[PDB]
Design an enzyme around this catalytic site. Sequence first.
Site, PDB file in Angstrom:
ATOM      1  N   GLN A  22      -1.779  -6.562  -8.683  1.00 13.62           N
ATOM      2  CA  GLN A  22      -1.447  -7.968  -8.482  1.00 13.62           C
ATOM      3  C   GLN A  22      -1.408  -8.314  -6.999  1.00 13.62           C
ATOM      4  O   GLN A  22      -1.936  -9.351  -6.578  1.00 13.62           O
ATOM      5  CB  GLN A  22      -0.113  -8.294  -9.151  1.00 13.62           C
ATOM      6  N   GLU A  49      -3.644  -6.479 -16.552  1.00 13.13           N
ATOM      7  CA  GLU A  49      -3.063  -7.693 -17.099  1.00 13.13           C
ATOM      8  C   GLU A  49      -3.973  -8.869 -16.783  1.00 13.13           C
ATOM      9  O   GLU A  49      -4.348  -9.058 -15.617  1.00 13.13           O
ATOM     10  CB  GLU A  49      -1.657  -7.911 -16.545  1.00 13.13           C
ATOM     11  N   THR A  59      -0.139   0.308 -12.696  1.00 16.78           N
ATOM     12  CA  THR A  59      -1.579   0.165 -12.878  1.00 16.78           C
ATOM     13  C   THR A  59      -2.308   0.166 -11.541  1.00 16.78           C
ATOM     14  O   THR A  59      -3.385   0.761 -11.418  1.00 16.78           O
ATOM     15  CB  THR A  59      -1.892  -1.104 -13.676  1.00 16.78           C
ATOM     16  N   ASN A 107       6.500  -4.675   3.531  1.00 17.44           N
ATOM     17  CA  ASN A 107       6.787  -6.104   3.450  1.00 17.44           C
ATOM     18  C   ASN A 107       7.999  -6.514   4.278  1.00 17.44           C
ATOM     19  O   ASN A 107       8.095  -7.677   4.690  1.00 17.44           O
ATOM     20  CB  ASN A 107       7.002  -6.510   1.993  1.00 17.44           C
ATOM     21  N   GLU A 122     -16.646   3.968  14.048  1.00 15.93           N
ATOM     22  CA  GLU A 122     -15.932   4.262  15.288  1.00 15.93           C
ATOM     23  C   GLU A 122     -14.427   4.101  15.114  1.00 15.93           C
ATOM     24  O   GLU A 122     -13.741   3.544  15.967  1.00 15.93           O
ATOM     25  CB  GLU A 122     -16.438   3.344  16.394  1.00 15.93           C
TER      26      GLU A 122
END
Lengths: 77, 136, 436, 54, 430, 281
Positions: free
Chosen positions: C11, C68, C142, C203, C251
Amino acid sequence: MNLDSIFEWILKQPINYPGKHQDSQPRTNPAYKPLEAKAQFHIIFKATGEYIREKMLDGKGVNMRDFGAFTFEIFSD
Amino acid sequence: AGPIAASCYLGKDVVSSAHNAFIQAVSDLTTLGHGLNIDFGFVKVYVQDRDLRYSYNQNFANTLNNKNFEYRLRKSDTPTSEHWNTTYESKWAKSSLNSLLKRPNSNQVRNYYEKTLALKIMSLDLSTAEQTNYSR
Amino acid sequence: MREVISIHVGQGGIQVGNACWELFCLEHGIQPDGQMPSDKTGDDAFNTFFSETGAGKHVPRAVFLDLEPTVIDEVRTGTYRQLFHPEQLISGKEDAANNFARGHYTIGKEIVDLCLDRIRKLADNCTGLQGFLVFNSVGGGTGSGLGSLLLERLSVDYGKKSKLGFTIYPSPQVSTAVVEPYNSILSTHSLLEHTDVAVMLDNEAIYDICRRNLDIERPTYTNLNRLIAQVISSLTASLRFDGALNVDITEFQTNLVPYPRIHFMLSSYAPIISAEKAYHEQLSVAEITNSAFEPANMMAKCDPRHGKYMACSMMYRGDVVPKDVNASIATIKTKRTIQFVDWCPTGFKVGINYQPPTVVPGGDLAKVMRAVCMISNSTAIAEVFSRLDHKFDLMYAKRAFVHWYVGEGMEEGEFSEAREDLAALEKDYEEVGIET
Amino acid sequence: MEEESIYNLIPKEYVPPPKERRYRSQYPNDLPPTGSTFINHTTSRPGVANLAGD
Amino acid sequence: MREIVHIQGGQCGNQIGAKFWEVISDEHGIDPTGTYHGDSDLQLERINVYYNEATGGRYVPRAILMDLEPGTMDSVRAGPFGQLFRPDNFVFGQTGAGNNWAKGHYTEGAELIDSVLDVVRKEAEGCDCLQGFQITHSLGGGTGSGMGTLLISKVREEYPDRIMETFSVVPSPKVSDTVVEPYNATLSVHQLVENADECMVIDNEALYDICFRTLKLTTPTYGDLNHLVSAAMSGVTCCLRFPGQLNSDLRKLAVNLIPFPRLHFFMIGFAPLTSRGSQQYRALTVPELTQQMFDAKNMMCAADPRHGRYLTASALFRGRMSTKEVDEQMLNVQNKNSSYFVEWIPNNIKSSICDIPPKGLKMAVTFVGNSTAIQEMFKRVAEQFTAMFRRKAFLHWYTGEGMDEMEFTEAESNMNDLVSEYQQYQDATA
Amino acid sequence: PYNYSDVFATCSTTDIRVWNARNRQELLRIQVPNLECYCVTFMNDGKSIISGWNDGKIRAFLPQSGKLLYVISDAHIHGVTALSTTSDCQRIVSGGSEGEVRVWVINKQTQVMKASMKEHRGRVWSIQVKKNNDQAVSASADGSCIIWDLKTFTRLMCLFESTLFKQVLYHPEESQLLTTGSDRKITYWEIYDGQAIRMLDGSEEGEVNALSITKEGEHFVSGGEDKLVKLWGYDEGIKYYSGTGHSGAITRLQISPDQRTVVSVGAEGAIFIWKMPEEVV
Ligand SMILES: Nc1nc2c(ncn2[C@@H]2O[C@H](COP(=O)(O)OP(=O)(O)OP(=O)(O)O)[C@@H](O)[C@H]2O)c(=O)[nH]1
Ligand SMILES: Nc1nc2c(ncn2[C@@H]2O[C@H](COP(=O)(O)OP(=O)(O)O)[C@@H](O)[C@H]2O)c(=O)[nH]1
Ligand SMILES: [Mg+2]
C-alpha cells in the site's frame, strides 16, 4: 448382512466413508491398550446396545438420530 | 454418546464419527437384495429387499409388563432429597454399564510398558558385555 | 537509450508511486491523458521513464502489485486511468493481513508468475536498461513477502542487473501495527543478500522535518510521498538532463558501498523550507550544503554523530558552480563535529545537473533554483538494527504470535537464522568502524 | 574418477563450526531520538527533544 | 469483494440483525423497496459484500434467520425494511425450547438445522470468494445459545480456513430475566472457546449504564440498544467496504489482536457519544475521540478495564484525518498509562483509517480491546453456576433429554482453566 | 588390513563378511552360493580382497562394492589353501592341497603365472614372506617347513619334525621362526636349525593351532585346539594371564595393527575380541 458384514463393507471403502472410525484411536486411559478400527467399532456398538437397554428399562425411550427410534406404547386404563 | 465414550475409554469425536458412518446403511439398502439382520442385543431387526420387520426379546418384553413401572412413570416417587446427596460416581458404579470389559492390573500394565520400552530402546547391541562371569 | 523500470508493491509502495508518477509526468510536460500538452504546440528524455506507443500517448515503464484490490480500483477509477496500461496493475484477491508467511509462501506465489511475465514483457522492449527501482513498505505482510519473492526471482532471472530498494522501516517508538518486528526482520534477512543498494525511509524523521520546516502541524502521507518523490527525481535527473558532471545508476555501487555486506545508506534533502519564509534567506550553496549535513535533517531517525562516515554522494541540481561546491566541501571537511573513517581519505562523490527542481500544484515546497540531495553510508545506522533486535527478542522470549506464521507453511527455525544474520551484520559494521 | 578402497569404508562424520556468538551490541536499548517532537506534550520542552544526541 | 454472509438465530439475534440491516441499508442508501437511492458511486463500489443482485435492479441481504418459534420473525417481517429479507431464508420450529439449553441444542434444533445448514451452504457456494462468517446471539436463552453455538461448530468444522466471529450477549447477574442463565451460559462458552475464532461480548447492564450516563436520555429502549450495537458492528467492517489510508479487514484484525489461540474474547467501544445538552458544545477532535474511547464508562461491558492490564488494543477511525496526530495520540495514551499495559508486548495498539465517516458525522472511532479485566465475568458466572449446581437445582429438565452431570462438570472445569490461564498472563513479567 | 585396525574380515562356509572393531555390526558381505574360501588376505593401498575357494578358483572383489575384479581358474586341483601378498604387490603366492606352491604376477591388464610348480606332498596351512619380500616360508601338513628363495625357486632346505604342522611366522626383525603343529609343542627354529627354547605347550589333547606376535618381540599369543587361549612372554616361556570361556576349537587369533586388542574366531560361529594386557606396551 449379520451386523458384521456391514463392518467389513464399511471398512472396505475409506474414500466413500472417510472418518476417524477408519483407523485406531488412542484411549483416554493409558492403562488400556488400543483396539483395531474394526474391533473398537464392534465394542462401541456393544456399549450402545447396553446403553439403550438400560435406558429403555426406565420410562425413557431412546432414538438413533437418523436410523429409526426406539419407543413404546401406553394404552393406559 | 458421552457415557458410551466414557465406558469404552474412547473419544467423543471418534464415537460420534462411528455412529455417523454406521447410520449410512440406507446406501447399502438401496441396492437390490442385501437384507440387513442387525441385532446388537434385545431387539432383533430384519430388513428384506424393501420390507422391514422386527422382534423383541420375550424376557425383555415380559420385564416391561412386570407391572412395577408405576413408580418409573411418575416423577414424584423420589423424596426429592437424594438428588444432591447421591453422587454420580456412586450411581455409575451400580449402573450396568462399565462392566463389559475387565479391568487390568494398573501396576502390571505400565510395569510391562516401560519395561519393554527400555528393553527395546537399548536392545540395539548384544555384543558388549563388560561383565563376563567366566566361571559362573 | 537508457531506461529504468519501477516496481511498486504494498500500500505504501502504491501511494508513493502515484506521487512520483505525478511528478515525472509534470516534469516531462505530459498531460494525465498521456499525450503532449494539448494542441498548443520533443527533446527525447521521456524515454528514460516513458516509452512511445507508436501512435501518440506514452506508457510508463512501471508495474504496480497488490493483493488487496482497493488501491488498484481507485487508481483505475481516478484521472490517470487512461495513462497506465490496463494489464500492468496486478491485483490479487485476498490480502496477507500483515502476515509475512502468507505473502511469502501461500498466496503470493500465484501472482508472482504473472508479475514476472509482465516484467519480461517490459524488459524485452528496453535496450539499454540501467536497472530496477523497487518500493515497498517493509512493515507489512504482503508487501514484504512479495518484495522478497520478486527480489530472489529477479536475482536469478537477470543476474547482474542493478536493483535499488527504497524501503520504509518502522519508527523507533511510533508504529501502527503490533507484529511488524517479525516480518521486518524476516524481510531484512531476505534483502541483505539480494539488494545491491538499500535506502532508509523511516517515517518519524519525515514527520519531524515536516513539523519543523514546512510548519505543517497536521501532515498526512501525501506530504511524505511528495518528499520521497522529490528525492527520486533528484536522484534520477542525471540520466535524462544535461549536466556538467553526470552520474549514472552504475556509478553508485562503485562509490558508496565499501564492502558487499554494507549496502544500507541514509538520505537527506535540501533546502526544505516553507514558502512563507523560503526566499527570505539567500539559499546559497554553502547554507544548503550545511543544512544537508545537519543531523536534524536526516531522512531516517538516526544520529550520524554517534559514528563515523565511509561514503557521501551528493547530487546538486540547479545553479550550482563547481568552485562553490569545492569551497563548501573544504569547509565540511574542516568542521570538527563530522569525522570520517581513517581508511577513506576522500569520501565525497559529487554530481552536477542543470535542470532546476519543480513545484507540483497543491504542493508545499517552494520551487528553487538550487537544491542538493545527499546519500551517505555511515556507521551510525547500527542503532536502529539494535533496537529492532531488542524489540524482536522481547516478543520472541515467550514465543508470542509465532503460531500465525507456523500455521502458514513456514517452519519454526527461520527466526533463528534471521536473528543470526542481524548479529553478523552488526559484527561486520562494528568491525569496519574500528580504526586500524 | 573414484577408486574403491578398504580405507574408504566407514565414511567420515560431518563436523561443522559449532555455534556463533548470540549477539554483540554496544548501543542501549532506549536511545531517545534527537529532534523528536512527540514527547513534549504536558512538559516545558520548547517543542523539540534533547536535540543534543544525549 | 471478499464478501461475508450473515446468520442470526433466536429472538435476540433477530432483534440485533433487524436494526443492523436497517443501519447498513441506510448507510448504503437503499430504500425499503430494495431500490438504489444513494448520492455517490462509493455506495455501489463494494455492495457485493452484503447484498446480492436480483433481476429488476433490486438487492437482497445474504442473511439467514433461524429460530424454534415463528413469532419473532413474523413480527420483524412487518417492521420497516422487512421486505428485503428473502422469505425462504426464514427457518422456524413449531415447538420452542423454553430457555433450555438441552432443548435448544439437542432435540428439535438438530433436526431443524439440516435445512438452515443447507441454505447456508448454497449461500456460501454462490458467492465468489468467502471472507468469513458473522453471528449475533445471546447466551442467556436456551434456543439461541444452543443453535447458535452448534451451527458455529458445524460451519467451523466445514470451512476451517474462513474467519468466524460472534457478537455474544452475556447475562449480567444484576439484570437477569430468567433463573437459568449460569447453566446454559457456561455450557455455551465451553464449546464457544473451542470453535469461535473471534468473540465480542456485550452486556445489557453496560448498555443501560452508558445510555443513562452518556446520552442522558430519559427512557432507554431495546431499539436504542440495538442502534448502539449496530453502529459498533458496522464500525468493524466499514474499512472492508470503503477506501482509506490503511484498510484492515477482519483477518488483519484477528492476526494483530490475538497473541494466543485461547484468548479470543474481546470487549468493544464506540465514539463519539455526546449527551443531549452538549452536542453543540463538545468539539470533535482526535484527542477528544481518544479520551472518550479510553474512558472506562464508554465501555459496553461491566468489566472495569483498570482491574487488569491490557494485552492489546485496536482502533478503527472513520473520517478524514492525518495519521500523524492519530499516531501521536495513541503513543501518548500508551506512555501515560504504563501501569495498565503489560510490558512484554510494547507498542500493543493497532490503528487503522477509513476515509468515509458515518452519515451525519465527520469522525468516528470503533475500539476492540483484549485485556485481563474480562476474567471477572467468568469468575462470577462460575460462582453462580456452582452455587445453583451444588444443590442440583433444575437439573432434571436438562437430564431428561440426554444430559449427564459429567458434561456440566467438564464445562465448569474447562471454564475455570480458561480463567486461570487468562490470569497468569496478567502477572507475567519480562 | 595392513596398518589398519578399524575393520576386519572373516571368511565363512559360503560368504565373506567385514566387521567394525568399535561396533560389531556387519558392514558388507560378499556372497558365493556353494563354495568356501581359505586365507582371505587384504592387499595394501585399498586394492581388491583375494580369496581361494574349494573348486580351486581364486577371486578378487572390490572393497566398496561386491563386484569381482578378476578370477583365476584352475589354479589348484583341490582348492587354494593359503595366500600371501608381497609388499609391493605385483605378485601373489598361493598354496594348494596336493603339495604345490605357486606364484602369480598380477597386473591391472592381465593375470599370469610363473611358478616353478614345486612339489610338497602335504597340504599347506601357512605361508609367510619376510620384510624385504625376498624369502617365503611355507608350512606343510606332513611335517616340513620349507623356506623358498622366491627368486630362483630353489634351495630345498626344510625344517624336519614329525607331526601335522600348523601356523608358522617370522620373528620381527630376526631370522628365528616360531611355529606350531599337531604336537602340543611350540618350536622355535633357526636358519641354522637352531632351537633356542622348546616350549611344550601341552593340553591333554589340545593341539596348538594359531600364533600371533607383537611388533616388538615381547610376547606372542598362542591358540590351541582346546577352548583355552594363552599368550607367552617371548624371552621366557611363562604364562602371563590366560583366555578361556570359548566353546570348541579356536582356530585363528589375530592382533590388531595398533595392538589394542586380540580377535579370535571360533569353529562353531563364535567371535571373541580380547582386551590386551596393559603392561605389554
Ligand atoms: N511512508 C509511508 N508509509 C506507509 C504509507 N502507507 C502505509 N505505510 C506503511 O506501511 C505499513 C503497513 O503496510 P501497508 O502499506 O499499510 O500495507 P502492505 O504493505 O501492503 O502490507 P499489508 O498491510 O499486510 O497489506 C504501515 O505501518 C506504514 O508504516 C505511506 O503512505 N507512506
Ligand atoms: N439487546 C437486546 N437484548 C435482548 C432482546 N430481547 C432479549 N434480550 C436479552 O436476552 C435475554 C433473554 O434471551 P432469550 O429471549 O431467552 O433468547 P432466546 O431464547 O434465544 O430467544 C434477556 O436477559 C435480555 O436481556 C433485544 O431485543 N435486544
Ligand atoms: Mg496492507
